[PDB]
Amino acid sequence: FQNVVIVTIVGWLVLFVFLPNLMIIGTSFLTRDDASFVKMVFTLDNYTRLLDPLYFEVLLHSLNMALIATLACLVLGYPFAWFLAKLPHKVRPLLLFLLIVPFWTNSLIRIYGLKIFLSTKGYLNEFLLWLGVIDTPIRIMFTPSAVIIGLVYILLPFMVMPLYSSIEKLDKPLLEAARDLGASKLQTFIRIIIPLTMPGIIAGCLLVMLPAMGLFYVSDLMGGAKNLLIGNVIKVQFLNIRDWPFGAATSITLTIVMGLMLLVYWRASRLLN
Amino acid sequence: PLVQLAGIRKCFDGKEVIPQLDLTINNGEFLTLLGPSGCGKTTVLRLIAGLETVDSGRIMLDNEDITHVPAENRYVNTVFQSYALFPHMTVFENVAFGLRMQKTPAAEITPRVMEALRMVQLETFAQRKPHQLSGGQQQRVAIARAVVNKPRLLLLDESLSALDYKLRKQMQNELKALQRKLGITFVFVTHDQEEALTMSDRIVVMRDGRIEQDGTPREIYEEPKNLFVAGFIGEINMFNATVIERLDEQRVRANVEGRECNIYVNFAVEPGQKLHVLLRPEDLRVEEINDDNHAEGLIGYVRERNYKGMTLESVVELENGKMVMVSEFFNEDDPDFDHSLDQKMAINWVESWEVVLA
Amino acid sequence: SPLVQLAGIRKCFDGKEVIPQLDLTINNGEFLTLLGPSGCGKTTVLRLIAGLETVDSGRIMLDNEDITHVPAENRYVNTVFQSYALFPHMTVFENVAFGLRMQKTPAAEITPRVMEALRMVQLETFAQRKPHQLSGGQQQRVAIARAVVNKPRLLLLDESLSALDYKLRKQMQNELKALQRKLGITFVFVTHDQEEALTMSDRIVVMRDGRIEQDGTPREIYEEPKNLFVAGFIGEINMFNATVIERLDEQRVRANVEGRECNIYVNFAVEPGQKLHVLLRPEDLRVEEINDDNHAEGLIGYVRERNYKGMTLESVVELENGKMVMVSEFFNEDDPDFDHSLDQKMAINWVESWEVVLAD
Amino acid sequence: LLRGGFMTAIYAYLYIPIIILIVNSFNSSRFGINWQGFTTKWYSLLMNNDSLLQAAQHSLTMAVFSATFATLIGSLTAVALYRYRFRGKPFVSGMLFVVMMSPDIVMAISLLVLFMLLGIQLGFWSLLFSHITFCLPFVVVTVYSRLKGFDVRMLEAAKDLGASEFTILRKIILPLAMPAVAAGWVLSFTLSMDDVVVSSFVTGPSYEILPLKIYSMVKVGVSPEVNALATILLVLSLVMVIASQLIAR
């Protein structure tokens, strides 16, 4: 009873999470095979192909579209949590559950529905023209702008939940002390609230940025061929090209970003606690 | 005349907490507000500090109206019961926060902060986060943060509740000396009779947002105004007396707790009036009655002796069924008053050492 | 008759020996209190006695039965926690009856026992009321009632009345004393308060760093300490320095106490030039007022503080040397009111044979 | 007055795609761009469709099974962490926290290569393990956060009162954790039904699921039965969540 759960929970994570990742990291050392797809031959030919401008402009182009989505979520998410903590306690649980209910529909079906709504001849173009605000339909499809709209739409609920927990756990007399000492609201925001809730911001940025760099059906449906994400490239190299070692090399460029972000969470948390 | 509060009204969630309050605070004194838990003392403190606005009335500070002046422009600092201490700043920066926020030239900031820390004996802890200190050090840091801005009046909100019984006794004297050396008004809020009684020059007793009595500790302890105050502070004894007739301008004869003694009354009385006699436990004389001669005082009994070291207080249960709870001292003539259990006694007081109300 | 005998008990925790060695015996039918500073290891002893922890060595016997390795499910020992450790989803009735139901008590007897136990603590009305609707005093009453039902040989209290306010705590102190007299079993109490331990206990054991420092009656502890830690820990003391000149008689020794000569009472042998410790309590000092060269016998000092407590007046006198002496005076004698200034020069004496002289 | 406007705008942003699919379900136009009357032909076409119904059944079955197993394992792990004290608890907390903060494509590929190396056919079992594995951390966090709000010495007090380790679990710990387990069950159920990348990677052709069929059928053209299918699952999901709420209380 006492020891069974500890071994079992440790045995489950190791067998299913940590051990497969080390092979992925060690899968970029072998060569390419047309049979078992690998061969014991230490090589570094995979990496120099990353620096190719063809394969290097795509990586840079994906990061730009992922950062703007995270910032748009952060501009739209921190204020959203602030108004929720200033509401009666009897309505807070209901409103949180009303943010997860769109999830009862599959993610791939929600994007297709968004495509018809924003189409050129669809709504928001007939209605926006019918009540004169514009003179010609606004075309956003198959543009980098269209991709940003999709990333925000899917991943917005993943940022509100971490911020609400951090905001709700603040000490009310702590914020009140600055007002007495002589700090205004603007001054109170920059020098007290933000440093205290930094671990919440960092955690929320991790749950919206990294998943946004692997969603390939958003680019397939709304981006076109020129606007591709790392998720589209890796899927092709594994299921169609069947070049596993190169796909593993592309994935580490995404894991490296994880390591940089984790250090900031620990040092921001250690400085506060 | 420092702070004048005129006709202040306050409503909270539709419930009135401050019906109508008129209070004047002089300059350069230590004032303590006393009352039971949750009686609007915190509301009054927050109103003076500026975190809330009145629903009616006027507030005057130094003959300048500050009724609607925001919390940013007042020269009053407060030390909180939560010991607000920003956790991501060192002690130096914690003290210097107020100076930096007021746009002070940087050549004077360091000396002022360092002198303020030296005032409260915190020289060594210049750079230590507010999680490496003890409770007393936190108290000192909060006081130094409040008083570094040179305020015109310092507000304390239940300051030393969470510490032990010895550091508490040290810092009571430390605060009284800091107040005397600085020379500014101190306003203190506590639920303890000992601190308010032993630390103040004037005490205001509050109850449901109304002032019961305001005066020096001697007056409040010796000359209460009603039965609530006489019993809220210290320990009191309630004797029911019925006046029979008047002997002279000061003495009257009555039936107190089934017996007939002469009590001192300095106001007009008429026969048949029901009276109240109040007595402190130390204001009571007791003698054993081992022999059959039981007389000279209320009879009572002994139900429980709780000795305390320097003194010994014993509770006497009369024939009617009321506890009396006497207290005695250890003198040269009385080295030890060792009483047995269920032993008959005799109850007496000291002439003219009593207070009678109506 | 001894009831519990702790023989050669040793305890180690995380490589730090919290309890080096403890030998102790508890008699049957008394109120015992363990006193010491916060963090000395009283709670560890309490848990060890209850059975929630094991010793690295030694033996514990209860009524001539070794219960050192008997699990904490058959011992007749119950403990009351400070936060009341009450189950919130059950009722008061079920809270009380939990122990009975788990011991397979027949159903026809459970209800009367529960009802009488609640009546013994005056909680008749609140049988079917959930927790979180009860005040702190009610929660202590519920915890005591729950512990008492199983008829234990040892009821263990763990800082029971720390969270309550003043008047309710003072009332419940007498209530617990009366309840202990009514039941007839040994009560063991752990506390940090001085007057709280002094008020109720018929026997006090003071522990420091795992060792027992003193053990005896409250009078025996307040008046004859064996060393400075116990004397200063309980009550208030005035530490005085003295140098022995010569011995006068069988109970008087010439001495130089705090800068002047004085005759003190010493029973044990002493040699000239020796250093002794003179311990006095604030109420033991006799102090007059030197206004204009009047009653100038004794030490000379100045008043730096004065405290009015309503029933007595406490005074902090500063000697010429620089030592702070605490003096307490009472109004009960025939001086109704009096009050001192903040720079008066004052004289200090004391009544003979009321000293406590400590060597070394 | 301006506070409610911001709150409504975000909700309108998150619900308009949903509103479009229900109305387009009752539309008569095949493309669905405009409104050309009311009809119910799409419902009838969906009821006679077999592959779509099989895919929906498979998705629902996977969601139910994965939610039950994830809830059970996570609740047990959280109780173990709460009840016991040891040196490695922060370490275990870090493993769960890190595995939650993980990209989906990397997890998908790791399980893909793991299943390919061992030699296990891709299908029911592999998908089940993947969904439980990425559903565990949320359940653990929810139940542990609920449990940490109660005193832990309560268990020892019950122990002094005469309770075995097995009896404390059923009589005490469980009734205080039932709303968290049920809440962790609904949360696990929702995640296992909106995940696309792992399912699209770690599956085969023996077990066909709903995302893959719709993804294959989108390129040629999506008939409104999918619009009809989306609204059927929503009503069926609105009654499963309310059943969980009723049972726990």
Author numbering:
A (entry chain B): 7 to 279
B (entry chain D): 16 to 373
C (entry chain A): 15 to 374
D (entry chain C): 5 to 253
What did the original publication write about this model?
The PotD-PotABC protein complex in Escherichia coli, belonging to the adenosine triphosphate–binding cassette transporter family, is a spermidine-preferential uptake system. In general, ATP binding, hydrolysis, and phosphate release trigger conformational changes in the transporter, leading to the uptake of extracellular polyamines.
However, no ligand was observed in the structure; perhaps because of flexibility, this further corroborates the necessity of the E to Q mutation (E173Q).
